[PDB]
Amino acid sequence: LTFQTSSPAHLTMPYVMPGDGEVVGVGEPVAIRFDENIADRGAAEKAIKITTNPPVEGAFYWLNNREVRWRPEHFWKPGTAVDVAVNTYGVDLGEGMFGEDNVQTHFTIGDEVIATADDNTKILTVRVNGEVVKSMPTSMGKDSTPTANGIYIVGSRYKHIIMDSSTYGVPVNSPNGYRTDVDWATQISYSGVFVHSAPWSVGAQGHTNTSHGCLNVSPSNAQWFYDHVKRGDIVEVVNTVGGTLPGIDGLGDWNIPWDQWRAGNA
């Protein structure tokens, strides 16, 4: 170990996801997020060594100036082991900013879990290693606030969460605005799409879209989803009147075509 000099005004620390020792689903990218904007992306990428077993090709793509992702062309094979070596200690990351430390993490890929929300049927079907294990009636975004189509990575889960329109700049007093207590909420986009419990739309689930974009399901089905679907599992939304989830959403990585992803943006 060679000492590197530092200043708290010219350091950036990397934060790696997923967590060390975690089992994640087949859609989980490696994520390295810095606590500062990175001017020299090529330097960051050169300092990050990702090894896979069985080996699979993958590549870096920056979602923004703070966060780089690495993934293969297709969903991970279940059982793959992934080692992430972020060797940034003392690395010049541009504009006088230096890497503060090294970070080192390992994780493994679990079962293939893919839930398809089909707007033509209003059914969310959960498949594990190809086989249907659950079918849930759902109510997605109304035509004026539709659910975007595309591949969503499952993120964090909450037994309870508050949906407050003011975090989107829409006052709760507005026609228009809302402040809703929600149970059993699984996040699937940074923009704010969740699968969650919605007793108020149970009669519409399987029939009519009534939400602001979220995937409304029954309390029991939302708890099932909370219990059985893990970070990195996949939700694919198809056949809505919405567009496509942005590839740089935070959980929309798989919507970027592979040739653009692999070419990168460093």
UniProtKB/Swiss-Prot annotation:
<keyword id="KW-0573">Peptidoglycan synthesis</keyword>
<dbReference type="GO" id="GO:0071972">
    <property type="term" value="F:peptidoglycan L,D-transpeptidase activity"/>
</dbReference>
<keyword id="KW-0106">Calcium</keyword>
<comment type="function">
    <text>Generates 3-&gt;3 cross-links in peptidoglycan, catalyzing the cleavage of the mDap(3)-D-Ala(4) bond of a tetrapeptide donor stem and the formation of a bond between the carbonyl of mDap(3) of the donor stem and the side chain of mDap(3) of the acceptor stem. Is specific for donor substrates containing a stem tetrapeptide since it cannot use pentapeptide stems.</text>
</comment>
<dbReference type="GO" id="GO:0018104">
    <property type="term" value="P:peptidoglycan-protein cross-linking"/>
</dbReference>
<dbReference type="GO" id="GO:0071555">
    <property type="term" value="P:cell wall organization"/>
</dbReference>
<feature type="site" description="Binds to carbapenem drug (covalent)">
    <location>
        <position position="214"/>
    </location>
</feature>
<feature type="binding site">
    <location>
        <position position="95"/>
    </location>
    <ligand>
        <name>Ca(2+)</name>
    </ligand>
</feature>
<feature type="binding site">
    <location>
        <begin position="191"/>
        <end position="192"/>
    </location>
    <ligand>
        <name>substrate</name>
    </ligand>
</feature>
<dbReference type="GO" id="GO:0016746">
    <property type="term" value="F:acyltransferase activity"/>
</dbReference>
<feature type="binding site">
    <location>
        <position position="216"/>
    </location>
    <ligand>
        <name>substrate</name>
    </ligand>
</feature>
<feature type="binding site">
    <location>
        <position position="96"/>
    </location>
    <ligand>
        <name>Ca(2+)</name>
    </ligand>
</feature>
<comment type="pathway">
    <text>Cell wall biogenesis; peptidoglycan biosynthesis.</text>
</comment>
<keyword id="KW-0472">Membrane</keyword>
<keyword id="KW-0961">Cell wall biogenesis/degradation</keyword>
<protein>
    <recommendedName>
        <fullName>L,D-transpeptidase 2</fullName>
        <ecNumber>2.3.2.-</ecNumber>
    </recommendedName>
</protein>
<keyword id="KW-0449">Lipoprotein</keyword>
<keyword id="KW-0479">Metal-binding</keyword>
<keyword id="KW-0808">Transferase</keyword>
<feature type="binding site">
    <location>
        <position position="92"/>
    </location>
    <ligand>
        <name>Ca(2+)</name>
    </ligand>
</feature>
<dbReference type="GO" id="GO:0005886">
    <property type="term" value="C:plasma membrane"/>
</dbReference>
<feature type="binding site">
    <location>
        <position position="178"/>
    </location>
    <ligand>
        <name>substrate</name>
    </ligand>
</feature>
<feature type="active site" description="Nucleophile">
    <location>
        <position position="214"/>
    </location>
</feature>
<keyword id="KW-0732">Signal</keyword>
<feature type="active site" description="Proton donor/acceptor">
    <location>
        <position position="196"/>
    </location>
</feature>
<keyword id="KW-1003">Cell membrane</keyword>
<dbReference type="GO" id="GO:0046872">
    <property type="term" value="F:metal ion binding"/>
</dbReference>
<keyword id="KW-0133">Cell shape</keyword>
<keyword id="KW-0012">Acyltransferase</keyword>
<keyword id="KW-0564">Palmitate</keyword>
<dbReference type="GO" id="GO:0008360">
    <property type="term" value="P:regulation of cell shape"/>
</dbReference>
<feature type="domain" description="L,D-TPase catalytic">
    <location>
        <begin position="113"/>
        <end position="238"/>
    </location>
</feature>
